[PDB]
Symmetry: D2
């Protein structure tokens, strides 16, 4: 599992559960090809998005549907979504955890890039 | 000045200076039209991107060129950019401060939305 | 104004207003002496805590009463407070902006340290 | 394991490894009694700090030695440490993950309070 997404809710201090995550790879024409997607689990994690075969070097976008998340909770969000865009680079560390911490008017994302 | 962008560098504990910021508005046809752009000043702030008249309702995207920022400091950052996408002025005109704090492998973005 | 505290509310996308802030300086004997205190204003800022003369080298603790803040909004937050502890003015006098972003179960604190 | 600490490095995008964490419980006299401590693992996690028997209701402080961490990496830190102070409350959710994301001049902490 070379790409994992973990999402946390900073309002309720919980995994952000059932958050839609779409992953895109930048095509040669600079458009975003849908690549992988899913909903975060009860631990706010999304595993099995890609394999080490499929996850080649390139620019990827992780799109977290934070707005849907907040709407389901009855809380007014600011952002349309949380968009994480990064170059997956073969060279060094290669397991990516994309950690997102969500608040209605704020989010942070962090990459944990390991071996 | 209804849309301000402020960028802080979490490594240096300083404003993130000369950070390129590009603003887009989603068009009727769902593409991103170029709305405004600028560089953060010495204070890490970007003022004067737009006006009350111009900043109409819509979905805007603020793309903060965090990569060039880190690169020019010799740091190969994780993200290509920090982009904040939001519906603006849905309940009437507001002042938006897009506050972003940058680390090579992390950024956070906060919105300060005030009613003038 | 060498020490400013700014507090943002990440739930409301607003300044965190009337947030009690207490500043302590570690004494020669290692206890926390009360240095200054105040409430964040409408802008979520707290200015005038100290002066260049008073703000001498030392280890300071800024305790942000984030709990009362959330409580008065009907929210039972996780943390009792947000406290930022730092050595100030080690390389000569600096201006410190303690920037804090609050969510009921999370807070972040950033330091903007500038040389006047 | 009712109290876990996870620390991440936002500069290197990695678990924050070998970070000293001290946990304190507020004594009746308002002093902080040392309670539990440890170093974060290679995954930036600190498990086994307490047990569900020992971890009673009360005000706890998690003190993360972020300054030592940054010094070992040759990076000038701002904070002396990251201090997380919270009331452990029996009532509801009761497994605490204290997540800290570290930068030299910034940190955030988040509580993941689960069942
Ligand atoms: C350690 C850690 C984890 C992993 C875990 O909890 O097991 C995590 C997962 C997320 F989805 C989001 C954040 C975190 C986290 C620390 C953290 C990161 C950013 C912020 S922002 C800058 O406020 C705060 C805290
Ligand atoms: C108060 C405040 C300001 C305004 C100012 O200093 O004038 C700001 C500006 C930025 F460009 C970025 C962050 C902040 C901030 C608090 C803060 C926000 C996110 C984080 S992340 C979640 O670690 C931490 C702290």
């Amino acid at each position: 599992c070379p790409l994992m997404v973990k999402v946390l809710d900073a309002v309720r201090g919980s995994p952000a559960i059932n958050v839609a995550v779409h992953v895109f790879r930048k095509a040669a024409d600079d458009t975003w090809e849908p690549f992988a997607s899913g909903k975060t689990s009860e631990s706010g994690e999304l595993h099995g998005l890609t394999t080490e075969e499929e996850f080649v070097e390139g620019i990827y976008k992780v799109e977290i549907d934070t707005k849907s998340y907040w709407k389901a909770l009855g809380i007014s969000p600011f952002h349309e979504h949380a968009e994480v865009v990064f170059t997956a680079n073969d060279s060094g560390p290669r397991r990516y955890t994309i950690a997102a911490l969500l608040s209605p008017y704020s989010y942070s994302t962090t990459a944990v890039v390991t071996n």
